[PDB]
Curated annotation (Swiss-Prot), chain A:
Pfam families, per database record: Ribosomal_S17 (PF00366)
Protein name: Small ribosomal subunit protein uS17m
Main location: mitochondrion
Keywords: Mitochondrion, Ribonucleoprotein, Ribosomal protein, RNA-binding, rRNA-binding, Sporulation
Organism: Saccharomyces cerevisiae (strain ATCC 204508 / S288c)
Keyword Nuclease included in the entry's annotation: no
Disulfide bridge map: none
InterPro entries found in the cross-reference section: NA-bd_OB-fold, Ribosomal_uS17
Biological process, per Gene Ontology: mitochondrial translation; sporulation resulting in formation of a cellular spore
Swiss-Prot record, chain B:
Record localization: Mitochondrion
Protein name: Small ribosomal subunit protein mS26
Source organism of this protein record: Saccharomyces cerevisiae (strain ATCC 204508 / S288c) (Baker's yeast)
Function: Component of the mitochondrial ribosome (mitoribosome), a dedicated translation machinery responsible for the synthesis of mitochondrial genome-encoded proteins, including at least some of the essential transmembrane subunits of the mitochondrial respiratory chain. The mitoribosomes are attached to the mitochondrial inner membrane and translation products are cotranslationally integrated into the membrane.
Gene that specifies this protein: PET123
Quaternary structure and partners: Component of the mitochondrial small ribosomal subunit (mt-SSU). Mature yeast 74S mitochondrial ribosomes consist of a small (37S) and a large (54S) subunit. The 37S small subunit contains a 15S ribosomal RNA (15S mt-rRNA) and 34 different proteins. The 54S large subunit contains a 21S rRNA (21S mt-rRNA) and 46 different proteins.
Top-level division of the source organism's lineage: Eukaryota
Record family assignment: Belongs to the mitochondrion-specific ribosomal protein mS26 family.
Lineage, opening ranks: Eukaryota, Fungi, Dikarya, Ascomycota, Saccharomycotina
Other comments on record: Present with 2010 molecules/cell in log phase SD medium.
Coverage span on the entire protein: 54 to 106 of 318
RNA sequence: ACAUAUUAUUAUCUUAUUAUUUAUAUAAUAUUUUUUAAUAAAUUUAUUAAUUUAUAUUUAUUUAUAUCAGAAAU
RNA sequence: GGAUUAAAACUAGAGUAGCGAAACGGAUUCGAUACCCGUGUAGUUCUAGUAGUAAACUAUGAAUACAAUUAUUUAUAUAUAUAUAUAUAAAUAAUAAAUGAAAAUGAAAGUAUUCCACCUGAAGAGUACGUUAGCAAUAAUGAAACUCAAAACAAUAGACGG
RNA sequence: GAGCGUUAAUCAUAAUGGUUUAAAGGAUCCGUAGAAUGAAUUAUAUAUUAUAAUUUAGAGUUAAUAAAAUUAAUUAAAGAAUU
RNA sequence: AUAAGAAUAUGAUGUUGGUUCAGAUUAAGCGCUAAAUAAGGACAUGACACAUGCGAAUCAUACGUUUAUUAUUGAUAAGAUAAUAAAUAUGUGGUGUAAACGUGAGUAAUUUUAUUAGGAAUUAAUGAACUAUAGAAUAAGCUAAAUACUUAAUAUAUAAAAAGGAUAUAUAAUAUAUUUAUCUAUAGUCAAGCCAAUAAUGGUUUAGGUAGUAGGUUUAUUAAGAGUUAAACCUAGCCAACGAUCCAUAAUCGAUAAUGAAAGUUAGAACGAUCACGUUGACUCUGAAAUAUAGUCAAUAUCUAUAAGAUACAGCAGUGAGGAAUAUUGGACAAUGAUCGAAAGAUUGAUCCAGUUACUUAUUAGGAU
C-alpha cells in the first residue's frame, strides 16, 4: 500500500498549502551496534491548510505535486498545534478583562485611603469619646457623626469591642474546630476498629448490608467514609 | 482533503478470471475448418497442442 | 610577478545548423476559380500555354527568440 | 553559541610617592650586552575601552547510585542526675578493600551508569599557508613533505653535588 | 620446488583502548540542538516504546524558625610608613 | 562456533609507544632457471595515432532486365506470344545492423547504482513479433514495372488499414484449390515510460548557498505526474556544522575474487548484472523506444576522386607510440547462436577451436635391491 509515516509538524504558514513534517524512523547502526532513530524533514501538501506547528499527523505518499513534494497530510492524530493557537487568542481577551477589573479595584482602594486621610478623626480618639460619653452621659453631635463614621448607632461597652475586632481572633476558633474534627474522626475510627462487634454493628446501623462479610480494606474504607459522614455531614 | 488532481483511494486490484483468460487467449476454432492441405494440418496440430499446454 | 595549457561562466560580440515565430512574392505545384489564345477531335468537347480566383503543400527572402562553436572579459 | 577571565600589552584622559623593562653610568670579571650599585623612562594607579592569553594546575570535565574503618573539627537535633552524653550530615587526616606501569589514589585515580572535550611514535610544529577577529602586539583555526627507530613515564642500585 | 628469489601492492597480525605523573580534561561556568540520556504505580496498545490516569524518592516554588556577615558592584572613611 | 605472537628501550626492571618480522594473496613486473600434459587468463599505461586484410549481408517465389530451345504467328525473318531451361542483386524493391562486440572517457547522482513482497498520474486507438482466435484484403495515379510511393473506398467519439507471388485445375483474362505473404481486431507472451523511501569517496584551510531558486494558480507540451521545458500571475520561501554550496577523485555491483576467527577491509582483471561511450559538440529525422557508431552543421586529424567528398580499428588480427609489463596480420562455420530466404541454401573475426606467453591451477616427471 501507499507508504505512510507519522511525524510532527515543524513548520507551517511559510508556504502556501505546504508544511514541513519531521519523520523519525528506526534503523540499526552496525558500527556502534545500536538501533538508532533517523530523522528527516518532509515537505508535505496541506490541501485544507488545517495543520499547525506542533500537531502530530500521518502523511501518505501521493503523486509528484512539485519538485520536492511527494506526500500529503492524511490525518491529524493529535492537534496540540491547533490548540496552542486557540488558547493564545483567548488569553489576550481573558487577561485584558482581569487586568481591567484589577485596575479598577486598585483605584478604588486608593480613593478610600485618600478619603480616610481627609478625616482627621482617629480610631483611638473616636474610641475615647464613645467610652467617655458612655461614662459621662454627654451626647455631643460628634457621636452622631461617629455613629455614621463607623455605623455604630448604639454607644455601649459592647460596641467598641465589636469595632476593634481582629481577624486573628476568628482564625483562632476556626483552627480549633478543624483540629477537633480530625481528632474526633481518628478516635472514632480507632475505637471502632478495636471492637469488631461494635464495628459490625456500626456498619449495619449506618445502612451497610451484611458488613460482616467484608475485607479489612474493603470495610475499613466504609468505616472511614462513615465516621467522616457522621462528623462532617451532621456538622 | 486529498491533494487536488489525485485519487483519494488506491486503484482497485485486478482479479483474473481463469475461465475468461482461457476464453480470450486460447479460444477454440469456431468452425471445424477443412484442413486438407499439408501445411494446414501441421498448423492445426500445433495450434491444438499449444492450446492444450 | 608571471608566461603557459585546460575548463567553466556571461546584462557582451560574432555565429553554422535547427526549432519556433513574423512579413512578402505578380514564387512553384495540385485542385478550384475568371476569362483568353493556340491546337485537336467531333460536327460544343478535350488538351496545352497564359490570366483571374480562393484553398492546401512547398520554395525564396525576411522579423524575433533559443542554439554547436569562436572572440572578449572574469 | 554566550558570558566572565591573572600578569604583561595596547587606545584615550588624568595621576605619578615608591617600585621599576629600557637607556645612560659605577663596579665585578680573562671579558660581563649579566648577577650587585646609582640616575631612573615606559609600566605599575584611577576612569572609559580593546584584547581573551598563563605551570588559567588538584598538571585529575560534569552528574548520579554504591562500598570497610579510625581520628579530628563544624553544623543541626536530642536528652538530662547540667554540663557533658547520644544521634545524623559536612569537611579534613590516616587507612581496609579495590585499582594501578608503579609512584600512589581512597570516597576516587574504587565498583557502575550518563553526557561532553581530547589523544593515536619522535622531530618537523602549535610551525607554514589560507581564513576569521583585533588599533596593534597578536588570538583562534591548523597542515604536509623530508629524516629517523626511535621517543617517553614510574621505579631500582649506583656515581656525583660549590 | 618447475619453479625460487626480489620489487610493487592487498588482507591479517591489540583498542575484549586511553587522557594526575608517559600523546591526550576545554580557563571557567551558563545554556541551545542532540536523529543524547533520565523516577514510581496501574491500564491499554500495534510493546523497553506510545498513550492515559495516578504517585512523590529526583528537580524546583513560597513561607516559618534558626544561623551566618562572606562574595560582587558602588559610595563614604581610617591607618602605619615613604618621598 | 575455529581469535597464539616475535625482534628492537634500558646499566638492569616495569610500563608507554612506534617500527620491522613470522601467514596468505595478485590483473602482477623483474633476476636466475625451466620437462610434458589438461584447464583457466592475457594493454591496468596514451577514450594516443593507425599501413593492410577482414568483422553485414540476404532474397531471382516483389518488379524489371538478358539468353537458349521448342511450338504458334510473322510469305523471309526483324519481332511478338506461350512453354521449358538458365542468367542478372552496377535498375526499382523487401528484411537485417536501438542488437551484439569493444571500451571505461564522462559520471558523486533533477540524471547513476543497489534495495523494497513500495507507488500513481490511478501510463497511448504504441507491437516491436511470435502464439490463439475472428474478419478483411477495394479504386485510381505515379515509375519502365511492382509486395515502391501517393491520393481515395470500406473496417472495434468514432478514428485508424492492406499485396501480392508461386504451383496446379477449370474456364476466357477469370475462377477455385494448395502454398507463402499483406492488413485489422481481442487476449497472451516478450518488452517499455514516470515517481517515492534507504544507501553509495575526500576536503569547511570550500561557510554560507539558491533567484526557476522554494511553494501556489493557469495554459502549452507528453501516453503520463512535476518549475521537466516554454509563457503568464502570485506567495517568500528552500538547503546548510548530523556538512550546504564548491572543488578534487572514481564507471557501479554480486550467490565474483583476495584476506581474516569474525565484524569487516581490498579489488572491480576473469564469470555475471547495470550504466555510459564508439574522434569532439550540438541539433534533427524515423520509430514504441535514439540527441543513434544514422543524418545535418561545426571542430580535430588523415586521405583522393577535389567533391556543399571519404575516413576516424574503444569489432578481429596487426603496426607505431607510451610503459616495468600483457599474445596470431591463425583455422572453421563441424557445434551453439544470430541475420536473410517459401525452400534449397547464403552470411557470420558472434562463436567454436588452435597459436603465442610458467600469468594462474592441477597431474605426471621410476620403483625395489
Ligand atoms: K504544483
Ligand atoms: K610612576
Ligand atoms: K565538559
Ligand atoms: K594514568
Ligand atoms: K613492541
Ligand atoms: K519471397
Ligand atoms: K578492443
Ligand atoms: K569510466
Ligand atoms: K494466396
Ligand atoms: K562538503
Ligand atoms: K554456424
Ligand atoms: Mg556554448
Ligand atoms: Mg594575584
Ligand atoms: Mg596611557
Ligand atoms: Mg649597563
Ligand atoms: Mg664595563
Ligand atoms: Mg638597576
Ligand atoms: Mg572584555
Ligand atoms: Mg601565545
Ligand atoms: Mg592554553
Ligand atoms: Mg591560579
Ligand atoms: Mg548543576
Ligand atoms: Mg598562532
Ligand atoms: Mg622518572
Ligand atoms: Mg605447478
Ligand atoms: Mg581488530
Ligand atoms: Mg576521564
Ligand atoms: Mg580544568
Ligand atoms: Mg591543558
Ligand atoms: Mg525536595
Ligand atoms: Mg610479511
Ligand atoms: Mg612472482
Ligand atoms: Mg590456453
Ligand atoms: Mg585500457
Ligand atoms: Mg524474376
Ligand atoms: Mg539492387
Ligand atoms: Mg548499442
Ligand atoms: Mg533501424
Ligand atoms: Mg569476447
Ligand atoms: Mg488490391
Ligand atoms: Mg497498380
Ligand atoms: Mg507499401
Ligand atoms: Mg593552508
Ligand atoms: Mg530546477
Ligand atoms: Mg505544471
Ligand atoms: Mg516562468
Ligand atoms: Mg575516469
Ligand atoms: Mg566494495
Ligand atoms: Mg571501489
Ligand atoms: Mg576485459
Ligand atoms: Mg552515443
Ligand atoms: Mg558523441
Ligand atoms: Mg553520428
Ligand atoms: Mg579510435
Ligand atoms: Mg584491436
Ligand atoms: Mg617502450
Ligand atoms: Mg603478463
Ligand atoms: Mg609478436
Ligand atoms: Mg574468418
Amino acid at each position: 500500500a501507499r507508504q505512510n509515516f507519522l511525524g510532527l509538524v515543524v513548520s507551517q504558514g511559510k508556504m502556501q498549502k505546504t508544511v514541513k513534517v519531521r519523520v523519525e524512523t528506526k534503523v540499526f547502526n552496525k558500527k556502534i551496534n545500536k538501533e538508532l532513530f533517523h530523522r528527516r524533514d518532509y515537505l508535505v501538501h496541506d490541501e485544507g491548510e488545517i495543520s499547525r506547528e506542533g500537531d502530530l499527523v500521518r502523511i501518505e505518499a501521493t503523486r509528484p505535486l512539485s519538485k520536492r513534494k511527494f506526500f500529503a497530510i492524511a490525518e491529524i492524530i493529535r492537534n496540540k498545534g491547533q490548540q496552542f493557537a486557540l488558547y493564545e487568542s483567548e488569553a489576550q481577551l481573558s487577561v485584558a478583562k482581569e487586568e481591567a477589573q484589577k485596575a479598577k479595584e486598585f483605584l478604588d482602594k486608593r480613593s478610600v485611603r485618600e478619603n480616610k486621610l481627609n478625616e482627621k478623626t482617629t480610631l483611638l480618639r473616636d474610641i475615647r469619646t464613645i467610652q467617655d460619653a458612655l461614662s459621662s452621659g454627654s451626647t455631643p453631635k460628634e457621636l452622631l457623626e461617629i455613629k455614621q463614621r463607623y455605623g455604630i448607632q448604639d454607644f455601649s461597652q459592647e460596641t467598641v469591642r465589636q469595632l476593634l475586632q481582629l481577624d486573628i481572633s476568628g482564625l483562632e476558633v476556626n483552627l480549633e474546630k478543624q483540629r477537633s474534627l480530625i481528632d474526633r474522626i481518628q478516635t472514632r475510627l480507632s475505637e471502632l476498629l478495636s471492637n469488631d462487634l461494635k464495628c459490625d454493628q456500626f456498619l449495619k446501623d449506618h445502612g451497610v448490608e451484611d458488613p460482616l462479610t467484608l475485607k479489612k480494606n474493603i470495610k475499613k474504607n466504609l468505616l472511614r467514609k462513615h465516621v467522616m459522614m457522621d462528623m462532617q455531614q451532621p456538622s | 482533503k486529498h491533494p487536488k488532481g489525485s485519487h483519494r483511494l488506491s486503484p482497485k486490484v485486478n482479479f483474473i478470471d481463469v475461465d475468461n483468460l482461457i476464453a480470450k487467449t486460447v479460444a477454440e476454432p469456431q468452425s471445424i475448418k477443412s484442413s486438407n492441405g499439408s501445411a494446414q494440418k501441421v498448423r492445426l496440430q500445433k495450434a491444438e497442442l499449444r492450446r492444450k499446454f
